[PDB]
Structure of 3-phosphoshikimate 1-carboxyvinyltransferase:
Amino acid sequence: SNRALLLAALAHGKTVLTNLLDSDDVRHMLNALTALGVSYTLSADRTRCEIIGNGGPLHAEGALELFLGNAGTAMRPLAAALCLGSNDIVLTGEPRMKERPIGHLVDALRLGGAKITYLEQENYPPLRLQGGFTGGNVDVDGSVSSQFLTALLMTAPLAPEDTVIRIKGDLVSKPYIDITLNLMKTFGVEIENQHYQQFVVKGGQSYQSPGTYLVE
């Protein structure tokens, strides 16, 4: 649901994502893009959205603060996406989200050139981003949902510089990460798939509007 939302936001041109999940983890993702200025529109059942491709990373210059609540599926991907270019945003979430480690993620993007901080605790929702994600060799932990690598996999490709993420700990969503690139490729961007040890994303990419896509 949120994968297509974000991927569509970094793509050039508005695209559609059907079979979206009518929940709070998604509405938060959508609320996250609209915050920067992205233009999305769901269906009567909130299962089909049309996201206007920002053309680049979720660009927002105004110290924007978002609330990903208890999602975790949109807080990690959206966190890294904005790390590109130059955007000032402070992330936040629900009471439980306050204890959702996000260091392995924030660490990789940061290594590529991203500018983030901890407004409350280290490796938690309170994250102030400032863009700067360019690229370079990176090492990301697989454990704790693939939202970590999934974030860099969509963010790093658009990063002006070539990013090479590796997989420190055992991936928790091994087959789910393939969907990340499978989603990106369908859009217009592809990356290098190492021996499941590193995700080399050709820097300088830019997803394009595929059209009508089914989330699933």
User: Anything to note?
Assistant: Helices lie at 2-10, 24-36, 75-82, 103-112, 147-155, 174-187. The chain has six helices and ten strands. The longest strand covers residues 61-67. The radius of gyration is 15 Å.
